Amino acid sequence: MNTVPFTSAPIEVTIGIDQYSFNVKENQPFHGIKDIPIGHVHVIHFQHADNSSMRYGYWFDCRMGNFYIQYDPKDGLYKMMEERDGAKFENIVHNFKERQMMVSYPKIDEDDTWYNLTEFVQMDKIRKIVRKDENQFSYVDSSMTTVQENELSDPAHSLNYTVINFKSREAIRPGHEMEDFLDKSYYLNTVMLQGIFKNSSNYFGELQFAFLNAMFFGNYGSSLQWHAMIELICSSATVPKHMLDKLDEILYYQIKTLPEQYSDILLNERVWNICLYSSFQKNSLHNTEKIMENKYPELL
């Protein structure tokens, strides 16, 4: 297990670590998070008590370095930093643990939720969507725009998701206009899977990352990307039968984890009704359809 120490908590803040969250009071003696499961990416996220504007956070993998969080009073946020002195990091972690000033990552043993949401998410792929090459961890916030959102504005601070546009020359072969617009299989299998993503695992990784950024930061462009990536599969007549099987599992756990009170802002009625009841794959998502019908029947 690994640890992210906090130098201090000078402002009152709700801190998230993956799907968990806790409140820290202003100047409370909080010095970090311990027992973080090795083997997954993680996200540590923040919402200030005195200004719920800008949810922000950091994607990281404890296998890639030793990271700590320190408040910057000039920029007014909690920043992630990499500790390059290992001996210092060990002493700082041990002292904070001995004084019991850390919260424990509260993982239940039966509970596979975080694996199920991040199965295909890799740090190296995150670092290509979020470009800041001098850090091993990646900052995301509520207001960052996507590359596609910007084509329709500072490119350094953008989410470089793969652009998906159903009415684009990329999606539509000349001479196959009707075919390719009504059946997205060309665009899914040749352009996206064989061409850009190289395999279904990378495609699902980006889909999962987009969902998590929408849920944890309320990032609107990430929500658009998540729905586009679902719709592209669902609107394709030809998809590897094992590929739809994994899609159903991925979506099931996303819908299961979504806060009930955020469903009105995180779920696109059009896309979901089309995917579950009208699309080529309307019968291929039994687990997702069952949870959607029992948890959010209003949307449908």
List contacts with another protein (CB under 8 A).
Answer: 167-169, 172, 174, 177-178, 181
Contact 119, 250 (CB under 8 A): yes
Residue 181 interacting partner from ligand VNX, another protein, none (CB closer than 5 to 8 Å by kind):
another protein
Question: 65 or 218: whose CB is closer to ligand VNX?
Answer: 65
Contact status: 185 vs ligand VNX (CB under 6 A): no
Question: 93 or 172: whose CB is closer to another protein?
Answer: 172
For ligand VNX, the binding residue among 58, 59, 78, 89 (CB under 6 A) is 89
| Residue 224 CB, nearest approach to another protein (Å) | 19
Distance of CA 183 to the CA centre of its chain: 28
Question: 7 or 263: whose CB is closer to ligand VNX?
Answer: 7
Question: 169 or 242: whose CB is closer to another protein?
Answer: 169
Beta bridge mates, 21: 16
Residue 69 interacting partner from ligand VNX, another protein, none (CB closer than 5 to 8 Å by kind):
none
| Residue 3 CB, nearest approach to ligand VNX (Å) | 9
Contact 185, 195 (CB under 8 A): no
Question: 156 or 178: whose CB is closer to another protein?
Answer: 178
Number of Cβ within a 10 Å radius of residue 148: 19
Contact 184, 166 (CB under 8 A): yes
Q: What are the two backbone dihedrals, phi and then psi, of residue 101, each rounded to the nearest 5 degrees?
A: -105, 20
Contact status: 5 vs ligand VNX (CB under 6 A): yes
| Residue 27 CB, nearest approach to another protein (Å) | 55
Distance CA(225)–CA(24), nearest Å, equals 32
Site string for ligand VNX, 8-47 (x = CB under 6 A): ----------------------------------------
Contact status: 7 vs ligand VNX (CB under 6 A): yes
| Residue 81 CB, nearest approach to ligand VNX (Å) | 7
β pairing state of 42-48 and 13-17:
antiparallel
Question: 84 or 169: whose CB is closer to ligand VNX?
Answer: 84
Distance CA(279)–CA(268), nearest Å, equals 15
Residue 108 interacting partner from another protein, ligand VNX, none (CB closer than 5 to 8 Å by kind):
none
Question: 7 or 287: whose CB is closer to ligand VNX?
Answer: 7
For ligand VNX, the binding residue among 30, 46, 59, 68 (CB under 6 A) is 68
Distance CA(136)–CA(62), nearest Å, equals 10
Query: Residue numbers of the site for ligand VNX (CB under 6 A)?
Result: 5, 7, 68, 83, 89, 92
